[PDB]
Amino acid sequence: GLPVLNTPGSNQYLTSDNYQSPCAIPEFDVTPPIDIPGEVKNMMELAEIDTMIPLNLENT
Amino acid sequence: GLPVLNTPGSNQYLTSDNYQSPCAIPEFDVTPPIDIPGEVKNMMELAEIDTMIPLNLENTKRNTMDMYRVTLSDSADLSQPILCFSLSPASDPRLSHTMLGEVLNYYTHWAGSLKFTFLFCGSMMATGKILVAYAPPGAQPPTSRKEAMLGTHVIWDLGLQSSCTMVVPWISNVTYRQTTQDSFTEGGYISMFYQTRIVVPLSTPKSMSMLGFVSACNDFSVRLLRDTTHISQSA
Amino acid sequence: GLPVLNTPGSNQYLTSDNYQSPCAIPEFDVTPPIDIPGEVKNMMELAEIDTMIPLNLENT
Amino acid sequence: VLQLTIGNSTITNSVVAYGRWPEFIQPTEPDVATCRFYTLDTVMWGKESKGWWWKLPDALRDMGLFGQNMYYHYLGRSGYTVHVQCNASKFHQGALGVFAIPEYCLAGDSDKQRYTSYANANPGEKGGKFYSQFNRDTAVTSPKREFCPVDYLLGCGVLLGNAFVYPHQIINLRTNNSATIVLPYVNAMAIDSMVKHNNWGIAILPLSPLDFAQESSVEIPITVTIAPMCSEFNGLRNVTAPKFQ
Amino acid sequence: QRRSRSESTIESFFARGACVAIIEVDNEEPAQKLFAMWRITYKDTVQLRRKLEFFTYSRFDMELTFVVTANFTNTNNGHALNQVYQIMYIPPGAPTPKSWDDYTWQTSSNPSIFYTYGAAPARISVPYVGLANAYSHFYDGFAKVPLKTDANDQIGDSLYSAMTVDDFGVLAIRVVNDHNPTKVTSKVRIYMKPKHVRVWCPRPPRAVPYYGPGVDYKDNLNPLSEKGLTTY
Amino acid sequence: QRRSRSESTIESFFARGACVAIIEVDNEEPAQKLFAMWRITYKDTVQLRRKLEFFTYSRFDMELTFVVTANFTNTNNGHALNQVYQIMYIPPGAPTPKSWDDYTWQTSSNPSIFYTYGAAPARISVPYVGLANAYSHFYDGFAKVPLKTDANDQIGDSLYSAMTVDDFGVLAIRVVNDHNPTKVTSKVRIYMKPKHVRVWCPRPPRAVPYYGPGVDYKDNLNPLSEKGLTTY
Ligand SMILES: CCCCCCCCCCCCC/C=C/[C@H](O)[C@H](N)CO
Ligand SMILES: CCCCCCCCCCCCC/C=C/[C@H](O)[C@H](N)CO
C-alpha cells in the first residue's frame, strides 16, 4: 500500500508520551459529572494555600 | 487499518536524519531568551575574523610565543625570502591551526578568497618596502623576487602604513577545493621579499618582528561537514 | 496513533523500486551545472549514430 | 583620540565589544558614584614579561563606592570601559594584545581539576601573570591552588593566535600608545552575583617583545583604567566580606 | 554570489548526532551492574564538547537516541529471551535507585523509556531546560564564597567553574527482565543532537587534549608541528 | 509513432541498483577484521562501471542501499544476540579508525548509519558532491607536473588519469556489539543507484575486460568470434 519508513524510536514505550489508544470498552455510557465543590485546576492552587510550618524541630 | 508498505531503510538510525521525536518533558515552560551580545548565525562568521598565524614553526620556536613572530632586519639577505607558505588554509601547518583552518578542518570542501594582514611591529623610525606575492599553482614555487614579481603581488611601505592587506582572490579550476593536501586542488603559494630594505637610524633596534593574520572574505564557503583531526580522545 | 496494516512486500529491497530515502549530507550546496557539449538524453540517440561493422570475421 | 568623560573622570581606535554598547535592563543605580574611571596599579612591561591578566568586576572590588555596592547588594550587573595606557618613544618597538574574554576561565597548577581557590582566582587589581611553560604544583601537603596560565595557550587550552576572535585591541608602540575597549554586560542571565562570578577577563600579552635602541634591559609602564558603565545592583542586605587571606 | 553557506549555519554545524556516553548494563544472578546511573553531560566525549565550546553561551533543544547492543558472556549453550531495557530520567532531587528492583523504578512522575531489544534505537526530544536564559559552557566563578565569619574554610570551598553539583540529573538504565541462567551484557550508547541551536560569544577551539570538566591542561601541550620558515 | 522510448532514457538506464562493494566484518574475541574500511567507487565492479563509461561526463544524485547477511563460523552451539552494525562515512581529511572502539566512532560530525540485523536494508541518499561541474569518468591528464627545477623525479610523478588520491573518502563498517563467545561473520553488500542522471560526451562501450581503475588492458583482447564472410 502506502510506502512508509519506520523512524527511530518505533516500538518504544515512553511513559510521558501522548498517543491515542484503542478503547477496551466501546460505546460506554459514562456517568455524567456534577458540580462538586472544591474543584482544583492547578497544583499551584494548593501551594497558594497557607499551611503551618514546623518551625521548631528539636529532638524532644 | 490503512494498508502500508515498509520501505527499505526502516528501523535504521541515521545520525544526520531530521525526524520528529516524542517529547520526554511535555508542557515545559522553557526560560525565555535574552539579547546576549555576540550572537553567531554562521560558522563562516568566525572564519572571517582575522587571527594570528604561526608563521615561524622552527624546532626551538614552535609551540611558544616566538612562533607568531617573523624576524625582519636591516642585515638580512635581500635575495632570500622572508617567509613562504602554501595556500592550503586547512592542511598547511602555519594555517591549519588558525581559526579559519580550525573551521575548515570540520569540512571537506572550501571555496573563496583569502585575506592576509601583515603587521609591522618595529620602531617608528624604521622604514622599508616589502613585496608580498601570491603565485597561483602550476609553476615553480617562487624562490626569488624576480619570480614572485611575476605573480600577484603588493608593495608595502613600512614607514607609511604598519599593516598591509594582501587579498588572495579565488582562482581555481574546480568550484571547490579540498581541505586536505591534494595536488589536484592545490591553491598556490605565498611569499615575501625585501623590496628595498629595512633602514633604521642610530639608537634604534636593528631587528624587528612582524605578525601575520589570516581571514576569509565574504565570498568564502565550505561544504560537506566532517570530523576534525585536531582533537582526539584516548579510548 | 493512526492504525495501519502492513501489506505483503514490506521490508523487501527491490533494486528497481523508486522510493524516497533520507539524505546523509543535508543542506549540501551542490556545484551548479554548466552547458557541457554533447549532452545525451536517450540511449537510442547513441544507437542512431552510424558505426563501422566487423563484416569480415575470418580466423585470420 | 578625543575626550572621554565619564562622571568626574576624563581621559584624553576604540572598539565596542560585539558592537553592543552597555545598557540598562528597582535596581540601585549610582549614576556618579560608580560611573567613573578607576585606575589600577601600574605594571612594568620588560623584555622578559610573559603577560598580565585581570578579572572584572573582581578588579574593581575595592574601588570606591562601586565595591561597596558590589558587596552590599546580592546581584549586580555592569558594563565596563577598559583603557590601557603604555607610552613609549619613537625608538621603542613592541606590541601588546589586549583581549576582553567573556568567561575567561583559567587552568590550574595541580593534577586535581577545578581545584583553584577563590582567593587565588580573584587576585583583585594586582591581577596575575602568564608563564612560558606549565609548572605543575608539587606541594601535595599544602597545594597552592593557584592558576598556571600559559602565554601561548592563553591559560585556557586554546592557541593565542585565535584569541583575536575575542574583542581585542593592539597597542603597537610605533602607531598608538593606548587602547580602549567598551564591554557590555555579557552573561547567561540578565543579572548575576558579582562576588562569586566574574563576567570579563582582561588579558594583556606582549605579542612582540619590547626593545629600545641597543639597550639590554628596558621597561616601560602599563596602566589600566576601568570605568563601570550602566551599573545597577539589587538585593540589598548586610555587607559581604569575602575571605581573601 | 551563487555559492551558499547553508551547511556552515549553526543548526547545520550541530545537525549530527554525537555519542556522549556508553553505559554497561548486565543481567545475571543477583559488585554488580544490574542498573547503571550515568550523569548527563557532553563532556565524557571530546568531539561534541569541542564543537560546543566554539562558543561561550548556547541555547538548544536536545534530541537523545539510544542504541542498545547485547551480547553473551562465556555462554556455552545458555540462552536468553528478548530483553526490555528501562531508561529512567532522574532530575536533581528525585530519589535514586539503590537496586534494580527498587520502588523508584515505578516511574510515577519520572519519565522513562521501555526499549525492546532488536527494535529501532529509542529516540526522544528534550526542550531547553536551562535555569538561566542560556547554557554556560564556561563559568568564570564559583557557587560559594568563603566569608570572614565562616567557621572553617570548607564551608565556602567550591570547585572553580562549577555551577551546580547536579547539573541536570542522571539516567538510570536497567534490564527489566529477570535474570536468565546465562549472563547477558548490554551496552547503551547515547547520541545527542542539538536542534534549534543559538550561540553567543565565539571562542577559539581547544588546541590541547581535555583534562577534566574544565579548561585544565596537563599533557600534550605542544600542538604545532615543525615546519621551515621559508619552506612552501 | 506510438512506440515510446521511456525505458531508453538515461534516468531509466541507470534506475537499477548495482552492487559496488562487498565488505566482510567479523565479531570475535579481540590480523582481525573487526572494522573494515572500503574506499567509495563503482570500479570494484564492471557492470555499473561499464554502463557509466558509456559517457565521458556525468552528474547524478546517488542512492546507497546496504544489505547485511550474517552467519556463524564453525559454531558448535555458541550463539549470539542480534547485532547492530555501524557504517560511518569518512570524507577526505577526517580521522580514520585505528580500532573497532576508537574515538572516531563517536560520529560527532561524520554521518553514520546504525543498522539492526534482520531489519530492512539500510538506504540513504547522497547529492552531487563533485568538486567540478560534473563527474569525470575519464581524465586525460595528471595531478602533478614534473618541472625542470624539481629536486627528484618523484616530486612531480603522478598516476595517469588519477585526479585525487582520496576521491570521496571511505566507509568504515564495524559491529557495535561486543564480542560474543562465538565468532559471527557478516557481509555488507552496497548497492548504488544513480538518480537524476545527466550525461555528456558519449563513448564506445568497453570491449575487453577491465584491468585496474584505468583504460589499461592486459588479456582477453580478442573479443569478436569467428564467422563466415558470406554465412548468414
Ligand atoms: C527517559 C527520558 C530521558 C530524559 C532526558 C532528560 C535529560 C535532560 C538534560 C538536558 C540537557 C543536557 C545537555 C545540555 C546541557 C549542557 O551540558 C550545558 N552546556 C550545561 O553546561
Ligand atoms: C553513512 C552515510 C554514507 C554516506 C556516503 C557518502 C559517500 C559519497 C560518495 C558520493 C559519490 C560516489 C560515487 C560517484 C562518483 C563517481 O565515482 C565519479 N565518476 C568519480 O570519478
Side-chain angles (χ1 to χ4, degrees):
Chain A
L2 181 71
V4 298
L5 180 56
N6 301 122
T7 63
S10 296
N11 312 128
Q12 84 189 354
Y13 165 45
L14 176 67
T15 66
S16 60
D17 63 354
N18 192 28
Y19 293 140
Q20 293 190 246
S21 55
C23 193
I25 311 174
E27 296 295 345
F28 189 94
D29 187 6
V30 304
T31 302
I34 54 176
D35 188 2
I36 309 182
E39 191 174 6
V40 181
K41 309 296 292 300
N42 208 280
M43 299 299 297
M44 294 291 84
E45 294 179 0
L46 318 187
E48 289 174 342
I49 292 161
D50 296 75
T51 53
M52 204 154 51
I53 304 174
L55 292 163
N56 188 292
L57 296 177
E58 304 296 350
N59 289 281
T60 183
Chain B
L2 181 71
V4 298
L5 180 56
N6 301 122
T7 63
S10 296
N11 312 128
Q12 84 189 354
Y13 165 45
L14 176 67
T15 66
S16 60
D17 63 354
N18 192 28
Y19 293 140
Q20 293 190 246
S21 55
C23 193
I25 311 174
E27 296 295 345
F28 189 94
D29 187 6
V30 304
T31 302
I34 54 176
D35 188 2
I36 309 182
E39 191 174 6
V40 181
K41 309 296 292 300
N42 208 280
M43 299 299 297
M44 294 291 84
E45 294 179 0
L46 318 187
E48 289 174 342
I49 292 161
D50 296 75
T51 53
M52 204 154 51
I53 304 174
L55 292 163
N56 188 292
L57 296 177
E58 304 296 350
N59 289 281
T60 183
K61 291 186 178 300
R62 64 183 171 98
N63 300 310
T64 66
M65 291 294 293
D66 295 359
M67 68 192 179
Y68 297 97
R69 302 157 180 166
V70 175
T71 291
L72 307 164
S73 61
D74 60 356
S75 302
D77 193 78
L78 309 179
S79 55
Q80 297 296 344
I82 305 175
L83 51 81
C84 295
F85 57 89
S86 300
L87 194 84
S88 307
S91 61
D92 188 63
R94 290 145 297 202
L95 303 171
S96 61
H97 283 201
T98 57
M99 191 69 177
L100 171 66
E102 291 289 0
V103 176
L104 298 199
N105 278 271
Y106 278 105
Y107 291 87
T108 310
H109 305 143
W110 72 276
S113 303
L114 293 183
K115 186 168 66 61
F116 295 86
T117 312
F118 295 99
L119 179 71
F120 181 61
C121 299
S123 291
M124 195 171 179
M125 290 295 176
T127 175
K129 271 90 170 183
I130 299 300
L131 183 64
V132 186
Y134 164 65
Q140 178 188 6
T143 178
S144 298
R145 192 176 87 200
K146 187 167 59 179
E147 307 180 23
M149 162 194 67
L150 302 167
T152 307
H153 71 81
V154 62
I155 287 74
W156 167 30
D157 190 1
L158 306 176
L160 300 174
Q161 51 173 9
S162 305
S163 66
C164 168
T165 308
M166 175 79 268
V167 175
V168 170
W170 179 244
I171 172 169
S172 185
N173 52 343
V174 291
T175 301
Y176 278 92
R177 288 181 202 280
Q178 291 181 335
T179 59
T180 305
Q181 186 279 319
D182 201 67
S183 303
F184 190 77
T185 54
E186 54 189 357
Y189 316 95
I190 304 288
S191 59
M192 191 172 287
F193 293 86
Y194 289 112
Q195 183 74 328
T196 69
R197 184 164 67 93
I198 288 142
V199 180
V200 299
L202 276 64
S203 302
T204 309
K206 293 182 246 280
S207 61
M208 301 123 294
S209 296
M210 62 173 293
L211 306 172
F213 311 83
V214 57
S215 176
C217 299
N218 286 336
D219 61 355
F220 204 99
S221 179
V222 291
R223 218 173 52 172
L224 185 39
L225 182 78
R226 67 183 178 83
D227 280 325
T228 190
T229 316
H230 294 164
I231 191 71
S232 65
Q233 180 185 342
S234 181
Chain C
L2 181 71
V4 298
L5 180 56
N6 301 122
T7 63
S10 296
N11 312 128
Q12 84 189 354
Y13 165 45
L14 176 67
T15 66
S16 60
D17 63 354
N18 192 28
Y19 293 140
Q20 293 190 246
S21 55
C23 193
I25 311 174
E27 296 295 345
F28 189 94
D29 187 6
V30 304
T31 302
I34 54 176
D35 188 2
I36 309 182
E39 191 174 6
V40 181
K41 309 296 292 300
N42 207 280
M43 299 299 297
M44 294 291 84
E45 294 179 0
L46 318 187
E48 289 174 342
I49 292 161
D50 296 75
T51 53
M52 204 154 51
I53 304 174
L55 292 163
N56 188 292
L57 296 177
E58 304 296 350
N59 289 281
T60 183
Chain D
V1 280
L2 53 79
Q3 295 298 346
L4 171 53
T5 293
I6 180 76
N8 56 342
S9 53
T10 302
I11 297 176
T12 301
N13 180 35
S14 176
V15 72
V16 190
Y18 301 127
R20 283 283 296 279
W21 199 262
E23 59 182 5
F24 298 110
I25 301 171
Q26 46 280 6
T28 304
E29 195 289 323
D31 176 69
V32 186
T34 57
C35 297
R36 59 181 318 281
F37 267 107
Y38 302 98
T39 300
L40 285 55
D41 57 71
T42 303
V43 296
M44 222 56 66
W45 179 12
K47 297 170 74 77
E48 307 292 5
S49 67
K50 313 286 124 266
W52 310 267
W53 62 265
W54 298 266
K55 298 300 188 69
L56 278 44
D58 177 62
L60 308 179
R61 77 199 185 193
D62 300 333
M63 290 296 189
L65 284 175
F66 180 85
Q68 301 296 337
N69 286 269
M70 159 175 171
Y71 287 149
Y72 267 94
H73 301 78
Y74 163 42
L75 74 184
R77 77 194 292 270
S78 178
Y80 314 89
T81 299
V82 188
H83 187 72
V84 181
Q85 295 136 120
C86 180
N87 58 273
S89 65
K90 306 293 180 62
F91 300 77
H92 288 75
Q93 62 182 25
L96 292 168
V98 183
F99 313 100
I101 298 118
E103 302 284 11
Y104 189 24
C105 306
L106 293 170
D109 60 336
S110 60
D111 288 352
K112 298 180 178 179
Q113 302 159 357
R114 306 187 304 187
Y115 196 50
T116 304
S117 58
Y118 175 90
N120 301 119
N122 283 279
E125 55 171 333
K126 73 178 177 288
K129 296 190 286 74
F130 297 86
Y131 304 91
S132 175
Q133 56 263 18
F134 173 69
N135 308 313
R136 197 191 78 87
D137 178 68
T138 59
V140 63
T141 62
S142 179
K144 297 207 252 285
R145 300 186 60 181
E146 60 182 354
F147 288 137
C148 183
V150 175
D151 52 359
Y152 70 99
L153 292 176
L154 194 61
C156 52
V158 312
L159 287 178
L160 189 284
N162 303 336
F164 295 80
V165 71
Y166 298 122
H168 69 91
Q169 194 64 76
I170 305 179
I171 303 177
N172 194 13
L173 300 176
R174 60 174 289 100
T175 188
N176 60 324
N177 58 2
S178 64
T180 308
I181 310 176
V182 180
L183 316 173
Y185 183 71
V186 163
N187 193 342
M189 293 156 288
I191 188 167
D192 188 5
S193 180
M194 325 186 80
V195 58
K196 58 168 64 178
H197 185 212
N198 280 316
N199 310 135
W200 288 95
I202 299 298
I204 299 174
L205 286 309
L207 306 177
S208 180
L210 184 71
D211 195 335
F212 171 58
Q214 283 67 38
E215 300 295 348
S216 65
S217 298
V218 48
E219 56 181 1
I220 57 175
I222 302 177
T223 300
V224 184
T225 318
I226 310 183
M229 302 183 66
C230 296
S231 56
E232 50 184 338
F233 308 84
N234 205 71
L236 183 61
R237 18 121 277 238
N238 53 328
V239 76
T240 303
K243 169 68 76 62
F244 294 127
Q245 305 181 352
Chain E
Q1 294 178 345
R2 297 180 64 252
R3 276 186 285 97
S4 295
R5 289 174 171 181
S6 296
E7 212 175 353
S8 68
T9 312
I10 302 300
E11 186 68 2
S12 304
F13 185 69
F14 299 99
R16 306 289 190 276
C19 195
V20 296
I22 313 180
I23 308 170
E24 184 174 357
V25 194
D26 308 0
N27 194 23
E28 59 175 350
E29 178 171 359
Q32 273 176 127
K33 296 132 63 146
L34 308 183
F35 74 103
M37 293 187 296
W38 162 77
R39 176 156 280 95
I40 302 170
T41 182
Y42 60 78
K43 297 187 175 178
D44 300 3
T45 59
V46 303
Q47 294 183 350
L48 178 60
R49 180 181 180 180
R50 207 216 188 205
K51 294 181 70 180
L52 286 167
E53 288 179 358
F54 260 93
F55 310 88
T56 314
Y57 307 107
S58 307
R59 165 185 280 264
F60 51 78
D61 297 330
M62 186 189 58
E63 171 174 330
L64 290 183
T65 308
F66 301 79
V67 177
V68 187
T69 57
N71 61 278
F72 286 107
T73 304
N74 299 70
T75 188
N76 44 19
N77 57 12
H79 294 82
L81 301 158
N82 206 68
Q83 296 189 328
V84 182
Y85 299 78
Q86 183 175 355
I87 296 143
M88 183 176 58
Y89 170 50
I90 310 170
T96 55
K98 305 298 181 177
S99 62
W100 85 275
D101 55 359
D102 188 74
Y103 72 98
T104 50
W105 299 105
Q106 292 174 10
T107 55
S108 177
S109 299
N110 287 3
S112 175
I113 302 168
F114 293 85
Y115 161 83
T116 303
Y117 189 75
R123 166 177 292 174
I124 47 82
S125 46
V126 182
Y128 174 75
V129 299
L131 294 179
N133 301 93
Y135 292 139
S136 299
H137 313 338
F138 302 88
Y139 175 72
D140 185 56
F142 303 75
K144 293 184 292 180
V145 179
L147 303 181
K148 295 288 187 60
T149 62
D150 292 0
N152 55 93
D153 298 358
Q154 290 69 7
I155 297 172
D157 190 70
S158 176
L159 295 165
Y160 178 67
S161 67
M163 312 174 71
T164 62
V165 183
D166 302 0
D167 190 5
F168 296 113
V170 307
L171 295 183
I173 307 187
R174 65 158 183 172
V175 179
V176 182
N177 308 48
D178 296 3
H179 75 82
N180 276 286
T182 190
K183 178 185 183 73
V184 180
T185 300
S186 305
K187 303 280 228 64
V188 185
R189 290 173 172 77
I190 301 89
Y191 294 80
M192 191 180 290
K193 182 195 170 200
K195 305 157 70 193
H196 312 139
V197 186
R198 299 178 61 183
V199 294
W200 297 270
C201 289
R203 302 174 66 91
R206 183 86 178 188
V208 297
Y210 286 108
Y211 181 70
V215 291
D216 302 70
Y217 42 67
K218 165 146 165 288
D219 56 72
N220 295 326
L221 308 171
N222 302 332
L224 281 300
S225 58
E226 194 281 340
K227 188 66 174 180
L229 173 56
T230 56
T231 55
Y232 291 99
Chain F
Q1 294 178 345
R2 297 180 64 252
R3 276 186 285 97
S4 295
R5 289 174 171 181
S6 296
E7 212 175 353
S8 68
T9 312
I10 302 300
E11 186 68 2
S12 304
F13 185 69
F14 299 99
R16 306 289 190 276
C19 195
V20 296
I22 313 180
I23 308 170
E24 184 174 357
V25 194
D26 308 0
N27 194 23
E28 59 175 350
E29 178 171 359
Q32 273 176 127
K33 296 132 63 146
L34 308 183
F35 74 103
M37 293 187 296
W38 162 77
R39 176 156 280 95
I40 302 170
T41 182
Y42 60 78
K43 297 187 175 178
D44 300 3
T45 59
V46 303
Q47 294 183 350
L48 178 60
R49 180 181 180 180
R50 207 216 188 205
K51 294 181 70 180
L52 286 167
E53 288 179 358
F54 260 93
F55 310 88
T56 314
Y57 307 107
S58 307
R59 165 185 280 264
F60 51 78
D61 297 330
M62 186 189 58
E63 171 174 330
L64 290 183
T65 308
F66 301 79
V67 177
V68 187
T69 57
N71 61 278
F72 286 107
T73 304
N74 299 69
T75 188
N76 44 19
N77 57 12
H79 294 82
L81 301 158
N82 206 68
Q83 296 189 328
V84 182
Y85 299 78
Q86 183 176 355
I87 296 143
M88 183 176 58
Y89 170 50
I90 310 170
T96 55
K98 305 298 181 177
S99 62
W100 85 275
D101 55 359
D102 188 74
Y103 72 98
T104 50
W105 299 105
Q106 292 174 10
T107 55
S108 177
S109 299
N110 287 3
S112 175
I113 302 168
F114 293 85
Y115 161 83
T116 303
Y117 189 75
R123 166 177 292 174
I124 47 82
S125 46
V126 182
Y128 174 75
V129 299
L131 294 179
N133 301 93
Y135 292 139
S136 299
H137 313 338
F138 302 88
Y139 175 72
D140 185 56
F142 303 75
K144 293 184 292 180
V145 179
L147 303 181
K148 295 288 187 60
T149 62
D150 292 0
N152 55 93
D153 298 358
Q154 290 69 7
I155 297 172
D157 190 70
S158 176
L159 295 165
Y160 178 67
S161 67
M163 312 174 71
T164 62
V165 183
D166 302 0
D167 190 5
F168 296 113
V170 307
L171 295 183
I173 307 187
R174 65 158 183 172
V175 179
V176 182
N177 308 48
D178 296 3
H179 75 82
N180 276 286
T182 190
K183 178 185 183 73
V184 180
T185 300
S186 305
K187 303 280 228 64
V188 185
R189 290 173 172 77
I190 301 89
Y191 294 80
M192 191 180 290
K193 182 195 170 200
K195 305 157 70 193
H196 312 139
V197 186
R198 299 178 61 183
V199 294
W200 297 270
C201 289
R203 302 174 66 91
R206 183 86 178 188
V208 297
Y210 286 108
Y211 181 70
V215 291
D216 302 70
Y217 42 67
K218 165 146 165 288
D219 56 72
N220 295 326
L221 308 171
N222 302 332
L224 281 300
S225 58
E226 194 281 340
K227 188 66 174 180
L229 173 56
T230 56
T231 55
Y232 291 99

